[PDB]
Each structure stands twice: as C-alpha cells, then as structure tokens.
Amino acid sequence: MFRWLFLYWYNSTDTPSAIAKVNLWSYINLRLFKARLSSSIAYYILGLNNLELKKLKIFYKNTYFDYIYLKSIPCLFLIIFFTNLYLFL
Amino acid sequence: MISARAVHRFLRNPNLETGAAFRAGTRFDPFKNTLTVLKDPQNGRTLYLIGTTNSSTLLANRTKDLVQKEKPDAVFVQTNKEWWNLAKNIQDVKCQQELNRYNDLLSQAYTLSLDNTIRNLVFKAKFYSWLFVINWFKAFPDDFHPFIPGLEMKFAIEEANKQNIPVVLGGLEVDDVTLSALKVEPRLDPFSQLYYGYRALHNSFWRREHFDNYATLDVVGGEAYAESMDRFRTNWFVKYFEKLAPYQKKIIVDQKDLDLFYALYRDTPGKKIVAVVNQWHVPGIENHWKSATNTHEPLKAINPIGDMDINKYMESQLVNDTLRAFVSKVGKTEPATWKNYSTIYHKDNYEAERVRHVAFVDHKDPHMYHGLPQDYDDNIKPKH
Amino acid sequence: PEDEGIEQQLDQQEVLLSGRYDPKLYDFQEGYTKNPEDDQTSLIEKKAF
Amino acid sequence: YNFPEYRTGGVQANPGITAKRIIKCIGERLRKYDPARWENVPITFKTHFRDENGYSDVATSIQIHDALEREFGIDIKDRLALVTDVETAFYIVMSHHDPL
Numbered sequence: 001m002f003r004w005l006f007l008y009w010y011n012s013t014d015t016p017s018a019i020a021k022v023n024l025w026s027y028i029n030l031r032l033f034k035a036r037l038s039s040s041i042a043y044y045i046l047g048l049n050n051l052e053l054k055k056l057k058i059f060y061k062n063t064y065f066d067y068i069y070l071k072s073i074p075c076l077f078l079i080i081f082f083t084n085l086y087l088f089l
Numbered sequence: 090m091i092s093a094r095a096v097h098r099f100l101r102n103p104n105l106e107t108g109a110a111f112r113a114g115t116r117f118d119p120f121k122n123t124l125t126v127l128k129d130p131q132n133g134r135t136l137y138l139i140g141t142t143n144s145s146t147l148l149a150n151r152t153k154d155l156v157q158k159e160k161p162d163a164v165f166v167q168t169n170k171e172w173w174n175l176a177k178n179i180q181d182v183k184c185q186q187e188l189n190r191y192n193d194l195l196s197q198a199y200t201l202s203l204d205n206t207i208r209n210l211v212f213k214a215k216f217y218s219w220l221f222v223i224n225w226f227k228a229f230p231d232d233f234h235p236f237i238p239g240l241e242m243k244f245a246i247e248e249a250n251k252q253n254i255p256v257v258l259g260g261l262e263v264d265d266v267t268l269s270a271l272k273v274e275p276r277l278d279p280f281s282q283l284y285y286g287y288r289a290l291h292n293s294f295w296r297r298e299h300f301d302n303y304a305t306l307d308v309v310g311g312e313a314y315a316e317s318m319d320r321f322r323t324n325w326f327v328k329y330f331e332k333l334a335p336y337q338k339k340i341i342v343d344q345k346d347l348d349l350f351y352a353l354y355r356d357t358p359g360k361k362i363v364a365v366v367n368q369w370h371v372p373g374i375e376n377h378w379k380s381a382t383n384t385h386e387p388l389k390a391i392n393p394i395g396d397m398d399i400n401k402y403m404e405s406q407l408v409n410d411t412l413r414a415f416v417s418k419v420g421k422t423e424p425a426t427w428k429n430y431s432t433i434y435h436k437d438n439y440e441a442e443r444v445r446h447v448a449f450v451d452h453k454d455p456h457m458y459h460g461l462p463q464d465y466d467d468n469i470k471p472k473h
Numbered sequence: 474p475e476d477e478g479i480e481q482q483l484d485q486q487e488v489l490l491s492g493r494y495d496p497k498l499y500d501f502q503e504g505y506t507k508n509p510e511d512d513q514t515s516l517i518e519k520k521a522f
Numbered sequence: 523y524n525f526p527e528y529r530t531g532g533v534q535a536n537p538g539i540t541a542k543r544i545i546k547c548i549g550e551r552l553r554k555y556d557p558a559r560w561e562n563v564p565i566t567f568k569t570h571f572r573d574e575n576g577y578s579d580v581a582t583s584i585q586i587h588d589a590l591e592r593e594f595g596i597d598i599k600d601r602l603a604l605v606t607d608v609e610t611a612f613y614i615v616m617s618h619h620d621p622l
Contacts, residue, residue: 045603045613046432048401052613056604057577059293060507067300074287095562104568108575110500112509119516147516292556292581297573301506305513308505313515328558393545394538397567402537434602434617444619448530456529508574 002035092380096372099325104396119316123148123368124155125375129354129382136353136378137161137363140323140371141242142235145315146185149240156248156363163357164249165364167259167349168238172198176243185312186232188239195237199261201268212272218279219337226286226333228303233311235368236262245365255358259349262367266348267341276336289332298325318368327369346373354381405429410460415469417462427460533594533621537612540621541567543593544611551589556582570607578606586611594621 002008019025041056102113127136137159139152156164168176175195182188188195203209229235238261249256260266271277290296302325306314331338353364353374366374379385409429417423426437428444437444449457458464466473488494501512512519533540545565552560552571563569571586572578586605587598596618598605605611615621 043603044432045434045610046428046430046617047609047613048398049405051430051432052609054603054606054610055576056606057575058580060577098562100559100563102574103563103570104566106570106572106576108509110502110509112500112502112511113574115511117511117513293577293579294559294573294582297507297577301503301508301510304505305503305510308503309513309515313513313518316515317513332558391564391566393564393566394541395566397538397541399538399541434599434614436602446531450528507577510574 003038005035008035092385094376094380094385096376097324097327099321099328101321114319114321116319116322117317118319119147120151122316122319124151125371127375127378127382128384129378130384131382132359134359135361138353138371138374138378139241139245139363139365140368141239141365142233142311142315142318142368143237143239143241144185144233144235144311146183146240146312148315149185149244152241152365153244153248156245156252159361159363160252161254161361161363162359163255163257163362164245165257165259165353165357165362165366166238166242166246166249167261167366167370168242168246169198169258169260169264171200172238172242172261173246173258176238176246179243182240185240188243189232189234189311192231192234192237195239199263202265203268212277215277215279216268216271219277219282222279222282222286223334223337226282230306230311233306233314242365245363249363257352257357259352259366262341262345267345270340270344271337274336274340276334282334286333289329295329295332299329302326320372323369324372327372342369343373346370347377350374350377350381354378411465411469411471414462414465418465418467418469423462424460534616537616540615541608541612544590544608544615547589547593548586548608548611551585552582555585565608567608567612570609572606578604580604590615594618596621 014029038055042053043056044051045054046052105111105113107113123140125138125140127138128134129136137155139155141148141152166173172195175191175198179188179191179194201213203213246256263271290299302322305317309317327338327342330342349364349366349370350373353362354377364374406429413424413427426444427446428435428437431438435442435444446460447457448459464473465471503510503513514522529535545567549560549565552565571582583604583606584600587600590596590605590611591598594615596615598614603610603614605614
C-alpha cells in the first residue's frame with residue numbers, strides 16, 4: 001500500500017526477479033492497485049535543500065445538508081426582504 | 090511600564106504542519122483548563138482562580154472539594170444576591186442536570202433596575218432586541234449555559250458558609266454596572282447586529298473553526314463540553330464575540346476583566362482567595378494579576394530567523410555550484426539551468442526565460458566568471 | 474455444543490485478544506471536526522470506554 | 523547620502539535579510555488584515571498559514587501575495603503557487619529575478 005510514487009519505487013522487493021525466484025504471482029499484488037494518489041493537490045516548491053511537497057486543499061467534501069441550510073438562512077431572508085421591498089415600492 | 094504579553098491567543102502551533110493523527114494539542118485536559126494558581130509575593134497572597142462554564146457536575150465537585158480542603162480566607166463568587174437566594178432555597182440537588190431543570194427560575198435573577206421613562210423604555214427595547222440577536226448568534230443549548238450560574242457557584246458559596254469565611258458576590262455577566270456601561274454606548278441595534286454577525290467569519294479559517302467548535306457542542310453534551318474547553322478555545326470564543334460585537338465585547342469582557350481584577354486585588358480580605366468566576370474572564374484576570382505582581386513566566390526571546398537554517402540553504406547553493414562546475418568540466422560544456430532543482434514556477438522548462446546567473450558590469454569585472462565553469466580550477470577549486 | 478452465549482463470549486475474547494484493537498495503536502479523535510482534535514468525551518465516558 | 527549598491531541580485535546574496543523582510547511584511551499584513559488571529563502569534567520562518575488539518579485559505583494567501591508584491595516590487599503569479607507558509611514566500615521571492 002503506497003501513496004507516493006517516490007516511496008513506491010524507492011526500494012521495491014516484489015520485483016519480477018524475486019517473484020520469479022519464488023514463481024508465485026498472486027492476483028492481489030497487481031501493480032494496477034499498488035499505488036494511488038490522494039486526490040488532493042500536491043505540487044513541489046524548492047525548499048532549503050531539496051524539493052518540498054506542498055498540498056493545496058481548499059474545501060472539504062463531507063459537508064452535510066444541515067450546514068448548507070444554516071448557511072443559506074441569511075440569503076433566503078434577504079430574498080424575502082428584497083421581494084417585499086419591491087412589492088411595497 | 091506596560092507589559093504587552095499575549096492575552097487572548099487561540100492559534101495553537103502555527104509552526105508544526107499538523108494533521109492526520111499529529112494534532113496541534115490536547116483540548117480535553119480537565120481539572121487544569123479550569124483552575125489557575127496565582128501568587129502575590131509582595132503581600133504573600135495566594136489566589137485560586139476557577140473559571141466555570143456552570144455546566145459540569147465533575148468540575149462542581151472538584152471546586153467543592155478544593156474549597157473544603159484549601160480553607161481560603163475569602164471566596165469570591167461571580168453571582169448576585171437574587172441568584173444566591175434562589176439557589177439557597179433550592180436543596181437536595183447534587184447533579185447539574187437537576188439544576189438545569191431550574192434554568193428559568195435561576196435566569197429570573199437577571200433583574201434590571203431601570204426606570205420607566207421614555208428613554209429607558211427605548212433602551213430596554215433596543216437591549217432586548219440585541220440580546221435576542223446575540224443569543225441567536227451564540228446558539229447555545231439548554232445544557233450548556235456559561236452565563237447562568239449553576240452547581241459550582243452554589244457549592245462554593247455553601248462551603249464558604251460552612252467555614253464561616255466571607256463571600257464576595259461580583260454580580261452576573263450583565264449586572265447594573267455593565268448595564269449602565271451598555272447604556273453609555275449607543276451602538277446597540279438588532280439589525281446592524283444581524284448584519285455584522287453574518288459578516289464576522291470573513292475567511293474560511295474562522296468559518297471552519299466555528300463549525301467544529303459548535304459541532305463538538307452538538308455531539309458531546311454541555312457537561313462533556315465544559316471539560317474540554319481550554320484556554321485556546323476560550324480565547325477563540327472571546328475573539329468570536331469581538332468579531333460579532335467589538336463594542337459590547339469591550340464592555341463585557343475587557344472592562345469586566347479589569348473590574349474583577351480590581352476586586353480580587355484590592356477589595357478582598359486576602360492572604361488566601363478562591364475566586365469562582367466565569368470561564369472567559371480568567372485570561373484577563375490572570376494577565377492583570379501577573380503584570381501587577383510581576384509574576385510572569387520568564388521571557389524566551391524569539392528570533393524571527395531562529396528556526397531558519399541558513400546553513401542548509403548556503404550549503405545547498407555551494408554544493409550545487411560545485412556540482413555544476415564539476416559536470417561542466419567533465420562534459421566540456423556549461424550548465425543549462427543554474428537552478429538547483431527544477432520546479433514549475435518560472436515555466437523555464439518550456440518557455441524562453443532562462444535562469445542563467447551571469448552578472449558583470451564591464452570587461453574588468455572580477456565577478457564576470459562567477460557561475461561559469463571557468464571560475465574553477467581543474468581540481469574543482471572554488472577560486473580561479 | 475456451539476452454545477450461542479458461550480460462543481459469543483469466546484468471539485468477543487478472540488476479537489479483543491487478536492491485538493488489532495490495542496488502544497496504544499490508536500489516536501482517538503473527533504472525526505467530524507474539520508481540524509484534527511482529540512477525543513473530547515467526558516471523563517466518565519472515557520473511563521467507561 | 524548612502525549610495526545604493528551597484529551589484530545586482532542583492533536579495534539572493536542575503537538569505538537572512540530577505541527572510542527578515544519577508545517575515546516583517548507578512549506579519550504587518552496579517553496583523554492588519556486579520557488582527558483577531560495574528561496579533562498575538564509570532565511569525566517566524568517555520569510559521570505556516572494553513573488550518574490544523576493542512577487546509578489553506580485563499581484570502582489570507584492573496585493578502586500575503588499583495589504584501590510581498592508591495593514589499594519587493596515583484597508580480598507574484600497567483601495561479602502558479604499559493605503562499606501558505608514563510609518558506610513558500612521565501613522560495614517565491616528568491617526565485618524571482620527582479621526583487622528589490
């Protein structure tokens with residue numbers, strides 16, 4: 001289980017040479033599933049000695065409906081106020 | 090003269106890169122977020138400042154035991170005579186839920202001795218509207234009422250009466266003194282308060298913080314939330330109040346902190362004081378007490394570049410310059426980038442803007458060959 | 474006899490003795506909070522857990 | 523009268539002074555823009571401007587970009603990198619070829 005390619009490819013002991021020395025190629029060890037990124041932006045800047053990995057995470061994805069409803073009350077009241085103001089004037 | 094120490098700081102560990110099981114700190118820490126010990130070596134006085142949210146039975150029992158065993162020379166409880174009468178007439182209650190059952194009766198102690206004149210009636214209307222709006226923005230449940238005193242105050246007063254030591258009542262959060270102070274400030278308005286309270290969280294950070302704070306209050310009850318309110322959470326709440334209503338925050342927090350410090354420092358018997366005050370007055374009272382008694386923790390000077398490793402940067406530059414010179418001499422060529430490690434901010438990989446570093450002003454400039462392999466000897470020696 | 478009560482007790486003992494659920498391996502947190510914060514349940518609830 | 527130095531690239535020649543300037547300008551801008559949060563927090567080289575979970579605020583970082591542009595007379599490309607710590611600001615400033 002790997003998240004970063006530089007950790008994935010650093011020291012891999014499940015290479016075809018060794019697995020052929022044992023000759024047991026299990027399905028769960030497919031390289032299609034071994035590494036997968038975090039789906040959050042991660043770019044590289046130049047630190048003091050080497051590359052520095054900076055993650056750009058802007059908004060959460062686990063918001064529930066109650067947060068949306070509570071954050072919408074001022075907008076709904078503004079809409080009501082503006083419509084009634086238009087009706088009166 | 091002025092000791093400008095930090096008082097209300099809620100940002101914890103901004104130098105850590107926390108997250109994913111590496112937290113910025115522990116917020117539970119009960120029995121320590123609440124009790125603070127302060128000393129006055131000039132007069133040999135000891136103060137036990139207990140900041141209560143009036144919601145936890147465990148803290149009420151701890152305060153009762155502290156008053157029982159410490160035997161102070163004075164107890165300073167932040168209540169008033171009306172609340173004390175109502176609470177002393179209530180008996181056979183030993184848990185905070187039962188006392189929360191009487192929350193309306195104890196809230197009857199909020200009595201305003203105002204006139205019936207036109208100006209006072211207008212002020213009462215404005216103040217009640219502002220209170221309604223600020224309670225909408227505060228949004229606390231029944232079981233968490235930091236401004237309605239509960240079992241901790243009652244136990245402190247009863248244990249003070251058992252030992253026959255004087256009890257000094259400092260008044261509730263909104264008492265006659267603070268009511269007159271709010272009368273002086275004409276900045277009370279429900280509509281402006283609504284508009285400013287829906288603009289307080291001006292960036293994502295505050296919003297997020299807001300969420301999680303109240304999120305915990307919705308998951309854990311008032312009793313479990315009173316224990317997990319540390320100094321950083323208290324400072325965040327006072328700053329949130331400041332963002333909601335800076336003038337009323339100045340009147341209710343800062344000025345009342347100064348008044349409580351005055352009462353605890355001068356208007357008290359002394360030589361041992363147990364002061365059960367509200368949670369968010371503890372930072373200000375403690376800061377004022379330490380500044381007046383000079384009992385501040387020793388200063389550890391913070392150099393802005395103290396945590397900057399300039400040697401790392403300079404060694405990297407030197408190493409990469411030597412490597413560029415060595416590789417250029419081996420290959421009989423010149424460096425291509427002059428950037429130690431390739432990152433996409435300059436877009437020099439696919440555009441025409443090089444990162445070449447060759448600067449000189451004339452043909453006689455000694456620094457003409459700096460950055461070029463001609464600057465090094467055949468032994469890759471930095472000079473000549 | 475695969476007695477249901479005794480087998481359930483043995484199942485619980487096996488699950489807890491497997492070593493996967495050692496509290497030293499876990500940093501208990503309030504997962505819902507956007508900022509990573511420790512477990513803030515009350516002291517008696519922590520003792521019961 | 524103090525004559526300015528002829529040799530160019532003095533910002534890259536003094537990493538410590540560049541970091542001090544970055545710290546000063548960032549601190550002033552953050553205390554002006556968000557006084558309730560940064561007025562008590564000392565800003566050093568390892569200080570970052572993200573949440574405790576690593577989530578960054580765009581408004582704070584754009585304020586820091588404006589502060590760095592005014593301090594060093596540069597044009598920070600906001601779409602390429604976001605300044606979320608003093609180290610990123612140092613990298614951006616030292617990468618620019620016309621800081622002063």
